[PDB]
Amino acid sequence: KNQYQVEENGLSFPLSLVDDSQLWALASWLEQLAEEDYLISLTDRWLLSWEALYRLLEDEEHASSLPLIGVPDILPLRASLSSRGALSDSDFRVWIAEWATFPARKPIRFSRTGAILTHDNQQYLLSRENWALLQATEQLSAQQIQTPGETTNQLGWAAIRKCAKLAAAKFDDYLEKTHVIKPTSLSLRLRKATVADTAVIEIEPHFEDQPANWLGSFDKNLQVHDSYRIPGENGELSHVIIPPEVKEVLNSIHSIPGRRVAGSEALSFVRNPYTFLGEDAASVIAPEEHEQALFDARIFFHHFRLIPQLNTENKITEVTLILEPVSPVPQPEITFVFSAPWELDKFIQQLGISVAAQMPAGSWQGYELELSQFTEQQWHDCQALLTRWQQEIEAEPEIPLSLKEHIRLKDHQREGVAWLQQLFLRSPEETAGCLLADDMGLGKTLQILSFLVWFIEKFPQEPPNLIVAPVSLLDNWERELNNFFYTAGIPVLKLYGETIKAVKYPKQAIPAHLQSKGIKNLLKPGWQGEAKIILTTYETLRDQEFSLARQPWSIMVCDEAQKIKNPAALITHAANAVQARFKVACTGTPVENTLVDLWSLFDFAQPGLLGALNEFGKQYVRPIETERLESLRALIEPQTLRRTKEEVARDLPQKIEVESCKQLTLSGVQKQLYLSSVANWQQQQALGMLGLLHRLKLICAHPAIVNPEPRFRDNSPKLNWLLKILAEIKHTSKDKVIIFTELRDLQRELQHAIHQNFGFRPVIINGDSSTKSQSQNSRQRLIDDFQAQPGFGVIILSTVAVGFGVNVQKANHVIHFTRCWNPAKEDQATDRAYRIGQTKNVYVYYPTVRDTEITTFEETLDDLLQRRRALARDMLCATPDLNCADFETILKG
C-alpha cells in the first residue's frame, strides 16, 4: 500500500500520518523532509514536487530512508522529438510521441500523471532528464498558445534541444539540422601571444555548445547582436540568442580591438572583469573558472622592486628589476638588469601610462604587473630615482564612550581591544595590519567593534572603516553593533543587496573617460556619505574593487580571513588592492591546508613581514610540508593575537567530558556483525573503504539499522546507555539534552526510542542554512519551543552548520551519538551549549563502544579525533578531515 497520492505536481502525503502509530518511521521522515525543505505544506497535506523528488533521489543523506515511501523505479526511456513546420512558421509545434526502452528500443505507450508513468498496471518514474525534456516541450506548447511568433519558437526550441541533448533524445530531419543556442554562461579562453617585441594576450569567448563559425561572425560584425545567424557546412542553420548579461560581457570583449589584450585597460579587464562588468558577470563567468584560465595561460601579475647596486663612491649607473609572482604555488622570480638609464626610463614610462590610466594592471616585456599596491609615493620614488640617475650621468584599553552601560567586556576581550589599539597607534609606520586568530565563541565581533568605535570617536576626521564578511555574518555584525553600541554617532553603510544598487551608477551615466576605459560598473561619488563603517561582502569586494580601491580607508577588517587565503584569487587581489591604514584579518583557522594560507593572510595584513612567497615556501613550507616552526611563530607573534577557549575557561564554566560513556562494550551479536563486516569486505576486496567504515559506524551506533533482526533491537549498548542516562537526567536534575548525529535513520530510531521510554518525541533538525528564510525561521522557532518548555527535554540535531546564529544554551548535555571526522566541526557542534551564555556545567558525552580483543571503529575514531584536536590546538598546523588511510589500523585488528 503506497502512502502517497500521485498528482500533477508531485507526491502527496497527508498530514495525518503523524497521528498514525504503525508508521512512526514514515511520519518522522516526512517531518525531516519538511524541515529540510523537501516537502511543501498545502494546509491539508505535504507535497513532494518532481524537482524535489529528483533532488531527494540524488541525495545520499536520505538514501537509506527512500524505501519508506517506495518511489517507483525509473524506467529507462528515450524520447524521439518530432516537429512540424519551421521556426519561422507560427504553427511550429515540437512534440514527443515516441518512447523507447534504452537497450531494446521498443516503443511503448503509457499513461502519465506528472512524472510517474503507468505501463501494464505498473508505475514507473521518468528520468530527471526525460522529465525536463517533457517539461520543455509542454512549456513551449503553453507559450505558443499565449504568444505565437518566431521568438517564442526559438526560445522554446533552444530549451527543448538543450534538455534533449541532456536526455539523449532523437530529433526528426528538421530538428537535427536546425540549431538554436541561448548561452547563459561564458568561458574566456586566454593565451599569451607575441606579435612584436612585447607579448600580447588573446581573449576568446566560448559557449557550452558553440557553432563552428560563430566566432568569425562575432568578429566581423561591428557590434554584438541580440541574435546571431550562422550557417553550417551541411546546410545546417544555427541561431545563437545572446541574453542581456552575456551580451554585456561580449560587448566588453568585442570592444577590445582584435580581441588582443594590450594596455592597462584590457589587462585590467583580464585581471578582474567583474569590476568592469558588475555583479551580473559572476553568473556569466564563474570566478573560479577565470582564476583557472589565468593560471593555465601563465598570466601572473608580478610585484616588482627596483634595487640600485651602490658603487664605491655611491655613483650609480646600474639598476635591477625583480618580479616576485602572485601565484598559488611559489615560483622562482624573474630578474631584469637595467644597465642603462634609457631602458629604466622606458619602464617608468610604462608605469606612467598605467598610473595615468588609473588601472591596477601593467605590462613589461610580456610580464604582467600588479600595480594596485603601487601607491603615489612609490611612483615618486621611481621618478626621483630616474632623475637622480640622470643627474649623475651628466596595556589598558580605551573603552569607547558609545558602549552601552549594560554591556561589559570580558577580561580577555579587554586585552584584545588594548592590543588592537596599541598596534593601531603605530600603524602607518611600523604595523600595516594584524591577525586575530582567536577561536570562535570568544567574541571577536565585540572586540573589533569596540576598537572601531574607539577609533571613530577619537579620530572623527579620518576616512571610514571597511568590514568584509559573508552576507549572513554581515547581518551578524550589524546586529551586534546595534545591540552593543549607541549607533546614533556611528553611521553604517551596508554595501550589499538593495543598498549597493541604490548607490550605483546607471550604466549610461558613468563618465566618458571611464566608459572609454571599459568600466561599466561604478559607484556614485559620495556613496559612503556620512557612514563611518561600511559593511560589504567578499563577492562585493571583488565586484566593486575599482570603486572601493579609489577611496581611502582607515581600518579594513576581513572577517573570516580564510576567504583570502589563496594568493592568486581575485577576491584576494581585491582585498590587497584596497589601501587602508590598518588591516585586521579575523579567522579562527589561519592555516587550513598549507602555510601559504598564513603567508597570504600576513601579506594582506603586514606586507613584507614574511617576505616573498617563494622564499617563504623554500624556508617554511617545503622543509616542514620544530626550529623553523618556532622561528615563524616568533616572527608572527607581535602581530598575532590568539586565545583559545581553554585559556579563557575562567568565564566558561566547567566543560566536563564524561568518561563512563567512553567505556561501553560490544554486545555479542553486534560484535559478530562487525567481524562479519570486516570478513566480507576483505573477501570482496580479494575477489569501497567508505562503505566499510560507514557500515562499521552503523553497527557500533545502532545494530538494528544494519539488520532489523530481533537480536539487534535490544542489544545496542549505545542505545541502552542513552536511555539509562536520560532516565538519570530526568530523575535527578531535569536538564535539557542535545544528541548530535548526522544519520537520518539513526535520528528516527533515537526519536522513537525516546518517545517510547519517555512519552515525548524529540525534535529533529538537520538543515540550518543561513537565515532570513521561512524554513530557518521555522527551525529557530522549533529551537525556541524546545528551550522554553521547563524541565527535561531532548533534541536531536545534526553537527552540520553552514553558519553561526542558531543557539541552544538551555541544554547542558552534549551527546555525540555519532561523531564527525573533523575535530573542529565536532567542537563547533559542542560549542552550541558550551558558550558564553551558558550557566550550568556542560557535560559532553562521547559514547564509545569498546572491545577487549578488537579495536572497534569508535575507539579508533576517538583516538584519531583526540590526536587531531591536540594538533589543532596549534595555530600553524593544518588540520583536514580524517580519511580512510587514518582508519587502516582497523583492518589488522
PDB file of N, CA, C and O in Angstrom, residues 582-627:
ATOM      1  N   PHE A 582      45.166  50.407   8.520  1.00  0.00           N
ATOM      2  CA  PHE A 582      45.296  49.199   9.317  1.00  0.00           C
ATOM      3  C   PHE A 582      44.381  48.134   8.739  1.00  0.00           C
ATOM      4  O   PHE A 582      43.244  48.426   8.366  1.00  0.00           O
ATOM      5  N   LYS A 583      44.876  46.902   8.659  1.00  0.00           N
ATOM      6  CA  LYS A 583      44.115  45.799   8.088  1.00  0.00           C
ATOM      7  C   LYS A 583      44.099  44.642   9.072  1.00  0.00           C
ATOM      8  O   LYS A 583      45.154  44.100   9.414  1.00  0.00           O
ATOM      9  N   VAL A 584      42.908  44.252   9.508  1.00  0.00           N
ATOM     10  CA  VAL A 584      42.738  43.216  10.518  1.00  0.00           C
ATOM     11  C   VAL A 584      42.192  41.973   9.833  1.00  0.00           C
ATOM     12  O   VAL A 584      41.118  42.010   9.223  1.00  0.00           O
ATOM     13  N   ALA A 585      42.935  40.876   9.928  1.00  0.00           N
ATOM     14  CA  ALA A 585      42.487  39.579   9.442  1.00  0.00           C
ATOM     15  C   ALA A 585      41.909  38.803  10.619  1.00  0.00           C
ATOM     16  O   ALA A 585      42.604  38.569  11.612  1.00  0.00           O
ATOM     17  N   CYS A 586      40.642  38.416  10.509  1.00  0.00           N
ATOM     18  CA  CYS A 586      39.927  37.740  11.586  1.00  0.00           C
ATOM     19  C   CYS A 586      39.519  36.357  11.104  1.00  0.00           C
ATOM     20  O   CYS A 586      38.597  36.226  10.294  1.00  0.00           O
ATOM     21  N   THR A 587      40.199  35.328  11.602  1.00  0.00           N
ATOM     22  CA  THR A 587      39.817  33.958  11.297  1.00  0.00           C
ATOM     23  C   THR A 587      40.309  33.054  12.417  1.00  0.00           C
ATOM     24  O   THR A 587      41.380  33.282  12.983  1.00  0.00           O
ATOM     25  N   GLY A 588      39.501  32.046  12.753  1.00  0.00           N
ATOM     26  CA  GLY A 588      39.906  31.090  13.765  1.00  0.00           C
ATOM     27  C   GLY A 588      40.929  30.087  13.284  1.00  0.00           C
ATOM     28  O   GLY A 588      41.641  29.500  14.106  1.00  0.00           O
ATOM     29  N   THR A 589      41.024  29.882  11.972  1.00  0.00           N
ATOM     30  CA  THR A 589      41.953  28.923  11.374  1.00  0.00           C
ATOM     31  C   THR A 589      42.779  29.639  10.314  1.00  0.00           C
ATOM     32  O   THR A 589      42.450  29.592   9.120  1.00  0.00           O
ATOM     33  N   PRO A 590      43.847  30.334  10.716  1.00  0.00           N
ATOM     34  CA  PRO A 590      44.735  30.945   9.712  1.00  0.00           C
ATOM     35  C   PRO A 590      45.295  29.945   8.721  1.00  0.00           C
ATOM     36  O   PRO A 590      45.454  30.276   7.540  1.00  0.00           O
ATOM     37  N   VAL A 591      45.601  28.731   9.167  1.00  0.00           N
ATOM     38  CA  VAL A 591      46.172  27.692   8.320  1.00  0.00           C
ATOM     39  C   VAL A 591      45.142  26.583   8.179  1.00  0.00           C
ATOM     40  O   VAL A 591      44.760  25.953   9.173  1.00  0.00           O
ATOM     41  N   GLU A 592      44.691  26.348   6.950  1.00  0.00           N
ATOM     42  CA  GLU A 592      43.726  25.300   6.648  1.00  0.00           C
ATOM     43  C   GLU A 592      44.346  24.135   5.895  1.00  0.00           C
ATOM     44  O   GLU A 592      44.120  22.974   6.250  1.00  0.00           O
ATOM     45  N   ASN A 593      45.126  24.417   4.854  1.00  0.00           N
ATOM     46  CA  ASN A 593      45.801  23.385   4.079  1.00  0.00           C
ATOM     47  C   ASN A 593      47.314  23.492   4.163  1.00  0.00           C
ATOM     48  O   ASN A 593      47.984  22.500   4.474  1.00  0.00           O
ATOM     49  N   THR A 594      47.875  24.668   3.891  1.00  0.00           N
ATOM     50  CA  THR A 594      49.314  24.879   3.932  1.00  0.00           C
ATOM     51  C   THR A 594      49.610  26.183   4.657  1.00  0.00           C
ATOM     52  O   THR A 594      48.706  26.953   4.994  1.00  0.00           O
ATOM     53  N   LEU A 595      50.899  26.427   4.896  1.00  0.00           N
ATOM     54  CA  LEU A 595      51.332  27.692   5.477  1.00  0.00           C
ATOM     55  C   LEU A 595      51.269  28.839   4.479  1.00  0.00           C
ATOM     56  O   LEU A 595      51.417  29.999   4.880  1.00  0.00           O
ATOM     57  N   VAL A 596      51.058  28.542   3.195  1.00  0.00           N
ATOM     58  CA  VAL A 596      50.814  29.592   2.212  1.00  0.00           C
ATOM     59  C   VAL A 596      49.557  30.368   2.575  1.00  0.00           C
ATOM     60  O   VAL A 596      49.435  31.555   2.254  1.00  0.00           O
ATOM     61  N   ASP A 597      48.611  29.721   3.258  1.00  0.00           N
ATOM     62  CA  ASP A 597      47.441  30.429   3.758  1.00  0.00           C
ATOM     63  C   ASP A 597      47.857  31.506   4.742  1.00  0.00           C
ATOM     64  O   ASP A 597      47.451  32.647   4.611  1.00  0.00           O
ATOM     65  N   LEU A 598      48.734  31.182   5.683  1.00  0.00           N
ATOM     66  CA  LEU A 598      49.217  32.179   6.635  1.00  0.00           C
ATOM     67  C   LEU A 598      50.034  33.256   5.925  1.00  0.00           C
ATOM     68  O   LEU A 598      49.961  34.438   6.279  1.00  0.00           O
ATOM     69  N   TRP A 599      50.819  32.867   4.914  1.00  0.00           N
ATOM     70  CA  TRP A 599      51.567  33.860   4.151  1.00  0.00           C
ATOM     71  C   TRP A 599      50.629  34.846   3.469  1.00  0.00           C
ATOM     72  O   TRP A 599      50.893  36.050   3.458  1.00  0.00           O
ATOM     73  N   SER A 600      49.542  34.351   2.878  1.00  0.00           N
ATOM     74  CA  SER A 600      48.576  35.235   2.233  1.00  0.00           C
ATOM     75  C   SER A 600      47.899  36.143   3.250  1.00  0.00           C
ATOM     76  O   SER A 600      47.709  37.340   2.997  1.00  0.00           O
ATOM     77  N   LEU A 601      47.542  35.593   4.410  1.00  0.00           N
ATOM     78  CA  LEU A 601      46.901  36.401   5.443  1.00  0.00           C
ATOM     79  C   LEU A 601      47.811  37.529   5.909  1.00  0.00           C
ATOM     80  O   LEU A 601      47.360  38.666   6.085  1.00  0.00           O
ATOM     81  N   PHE A 602      49.099  37.243   6.101  1.00  0.00           N
ATOM     82  CA  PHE A 602      50.002  38.299   6.551  1.00  0.00           C
ATOM     83  C   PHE A 602      50.440  39.225   5.424  1.00  0.00           C
ATOM     84  O   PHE A 602      50.754  40.388   5.685  1.00  0.00           O
ATOM     85  N   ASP A 603      50.467  38.752   4.178  1.00  0.00           N
ATOM     86  CA  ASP A 603      50.680  39.666   3.063  1.00  0.00           C
ATOM     87  C   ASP A 603      49.516  40.633   2.928  1.00  0.00           C
ATOM     88  O   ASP A 603      49.697  41.768   2.476  1.00  0.00           O
ATOM     89  N   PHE A 604      48.315  40.190   3.300  1.00  0.00           N
ATOM     90  CA  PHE A 604      47.190  41.109   3.420  1.00  0.00           C
ATOM     91  C   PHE A 604      47.392  42.068   4.589  1.00  0.00           C
ATOM     92  O   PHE A 604      47.231  43.285   4.444  1.00  0.00           O
ATOM     93  N   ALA A 605      47.764  41.532   5.753  1.00  0.00           N
ATOM     94  CA  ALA A 605      47.837  42.329   6.974  1.00  0.00           C
ATOM     95  C   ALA A 605      49.122  43.151   7.041  1.00  0.00           C
ATOM     96  O   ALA A 605      49.079  44.382   7.118  1.00  0.00           O
ATOM     97  N   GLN A 606      50.273  42.486   7.017  1.00  0.00           N
ATOM     98  CA  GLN A 606      51.597  43.122   7.110  1.00  0.00           C
ATOM     99  C   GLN A 606      52.443  42.691   5.954  1.00  0.00           C
ATOM    100  O   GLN A 606      53.227  41.720   6.044  1.00  0.00           O
ATOM    101  N   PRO A 607      52.333  43.335   4.806  1.00  0.00           N
ATOM    102  CA  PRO A 607      53.093  43.005   3.605  1.00  0.00           C
ATOM    103  C   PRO A 607      54.583  43.124   3.876  1.00  0.00           C
ATOM    104  O   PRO A 607      55.044  44.098   4.483  1.00  0.00           O
ATOM    105  N   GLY A 608      55.299  42.119   3.431  1.00  0.00           N
ATOM    106  CA  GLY A 608      56.731  42.078   3.576  1.00  0.00           C
ATOM    107  C   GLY A 608      57.238  41.489   4.874  1.00  0.00           C
ATOM    108  O   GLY A 608      58.455  41.320   5.021  1.00  0.00           O
ATOM    109  N   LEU A 609      56.353  41.177   5.825  1.00  0.00           N
ATOM    110  CA  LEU A 609      56.794  40.557   7.070  1.00  0.00           C
ATOM    111  C   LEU A 609      57.391  39.180   6.816  1.00  0.00           C
ATOM    112  O   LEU A 609      58.485  38.865   7.297  1.00  0.00           O
ATOM    113  N   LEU A 610      56.688  38.346   6.053  1.00  0.00           N
ATOM    114  CA  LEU A 610      57.158  37.013   5.713  1.00  0.00           C
ATOM    115  C   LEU A 610      57.951  36.990   4.414  1.00  0.00           C
ATOM    116  O   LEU A 610      58.343  35.911   3.959  1.00  0.00           O
ATOM    117  N   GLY A 611      58.194  38.150   3.814  1.00  0.00           N
ATOM    118  CA  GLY A 611      58.933  38.210   2.575  1.00  0.00           C
ATOM    119  C   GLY A 611      58.104  37.742   1.393  1.00  0.00           C
ATOM    120  O   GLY A 611      56.874  37.659   1.443  1.00  0.00           O
ATOM    121  N   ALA A 612      58.806  37.437   0.307  1.00  0.00           N
ATOM    122  CA  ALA A 612      58.148  36.947  -0.891  1.00  0.00           C
ATOM    123  C   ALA A 612      57.642  35.522  -0.673  1.00  0.00           C
ATOM    124  O   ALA A 612      58.066  34.813   0.244  1.00  0.00           O
ATOM    125  N   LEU A 613      56.711  35.107  -1.533  1.00  0.00           N
ATOM    126  CA  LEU A 613      56.107  33.788  -1.383  1.00  0.00           C
ATOM    127  C   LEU A 613      57.100  32.670  -1.672  1.00  0.00           C
ATOM    128  O   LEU A 613      57.047  31.618  -1.024  1.00  0.00           O
ATOM    129  N   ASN A 614      58.009  32.869  -2.629  1.00  0.00           N
ATOM    130  CA  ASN A 614      58.961  31.816  -2.971  1.00  0.00           C
ATOM    131  C   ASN A 614      59.929  31.548  -1.825  1.00  0.00           C
ATOM    132  O   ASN A 614      60.183  30.389  -1.472  1.00  0.00           O
ATOM    133  N   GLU A 615      60.488  32.607  -1.233  1.00  0.00           N
ATOM    134  CA  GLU A 615      61.430  32.411  -0.137  1.00  0.00           C
ATOM    135  C   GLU A 615      60.727  31.889   1.111  1.00  0.00           C
ATOM    136  O   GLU A 615      61.285  31.065   1.845  1.00  0.00           O
ATOM    137  N   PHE A 616      59.495  32.343   1.360  1.00  0.00           N
ATOM    138  CA  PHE A 616      58.723  31.795   2.469  1.00  0.00           C
ATOM    139  C   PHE A 616      58.468  30.308   2.267  1.00  0.00           C
ATOM    140  O   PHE A 616      58.573  29.517   3.212  1.00  0.00           O
ATOM    141  N   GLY A 617      58.123  29.908   1.041  1.00  0.00           N
ATOM    142  CA  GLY A 617      57.900  28.498   0.771  1.00  0.00           C
ATOM    143  C   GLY A 617      59.155  27.662   0.934  1.00  0.00           C
ATOM    144  O   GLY A 617      59.128  26.611   1.581  1.00  0.00           O
ATOM    145  N   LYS A 618      60.274  28.119   0.367  1.00  0.00           N
ATOM    146  CA  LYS A 618      61.510  27.352   0.470  1.00  0.00           C
ATOM    147  C   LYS A 618      62.114  27.413   1.867  1.00  0.00           C
ATOM    148  O   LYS A 618      63.039  26.651   2.160  1.00  0.00           O
ATOM    149  N   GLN A 619      61.631  28.312   2.722  1.00  0.00           N
ATOM    150  CA  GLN A 619      62.132  28.431   4.083  1.00  0.00           C
ATOM    151  C   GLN A 619      61.175  27.888   5.132  1.00  0.00           C
ATOM    152  O   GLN A 619      61.625  27.470   6.200  1.00  0.00           O
ATOM    153  N   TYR A 620      59.873  27.859   4.846  1.00  0.00           N
ATOM    154  CA  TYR A 620      58.879  27.461   5.835  1.00  0.00           C
ATOM    155  C   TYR A 620      57.889  26.406   5.361  1.00  0.00           C
ATOM    156  O   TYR A 620      57.212  25.814   6.209  1.00  0.00           O
ATOM    157  N   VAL A 621      57.772  26.149   4.061  1.00  0.00           N
ATOM    158  CA  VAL A 621      56.763  25.236   3.526  1.00  0.00           C
ATOM    159  C   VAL A 621      57.387  23.918   3.076  1.00  0.00           C
ATOM    160  O   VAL A 621      57.014  22.850   3.560  1.00  0.00           O
ATOM    161  N   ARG A 622      58.347  23.975   2.149  1.00  0.00           N
ATOM    162  CA  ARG A 622      58.931  22.751   1.595  1.00  0.00           C
ATOM    163  C   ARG A 622      59.574  21.889   2.653  1.00  0.00           C
ATOM    164  O   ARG A 622      59.381  20.645   2.619  1.00  0.00           O
ATOM    165  N   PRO A 623      60.318  22.416   3.647  1.00  0.00           N
ATOM    166  CA  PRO A 623      61.054  21.566   4.524  1.00  0.00           C
ATOM    167  C   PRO A 623      60.336  21.218   5.820  1.00  0.00           C
ATOM    168  O   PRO A 623      60.953  20.695   6.757  1.00  0.00           O
ATOM    169  N   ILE A 624      59.040  21.528   5.917  1.00  0.00           N
ATOM    170  CA  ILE A 624      58.203  21.036   7.006  1.00  0.00           C
ATOM    171  C   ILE A 624      57.001  20.335   6.386  1.00  0.00           C
ATOM    172  O   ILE A 624      56.423  19.415   6.977  1.00  0.00           O
ATOM    173  N   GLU A 625      56.636  20.748   5.176  1.00  0.00           N
ATOM    174  CA  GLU A 625      55.465  20.206   4.499  1.00  0.00           C
ATOM    175  C   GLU A 625      55.846  19.626   3.139  1.00  0.00           C
ATOM    176  O   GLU A 625      56.512  20.281   2.335  1.00  0.00           O
ATOM    177  N   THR A 626      59.559  22.156  16.476  1.00  0.00           N
ATOM    178  CA  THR A 626      60.385  22.346  15.289  1.00  0.00           C
ATOM    179  C   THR A 626      61.011  23.737  15.298  1.00  0.00           C
ATOM    180  O   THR A 626      60.353  24.719  15.643  1.00  0.00           O
ATOM    181  N   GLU A 627      62.292  23.810  14.926  1.00  0.00           N
ATOM    182  CA  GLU A 627      63.013  25.079  14.993  1.00  0.00           C
ATOM    183  C   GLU A 627      62.467  26.093  13.991  1.00  0.00           C
ATOM    184  O   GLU A 627      62.303  27.273  14.324  1.00  0.00           O
TER     185      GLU A 627
END
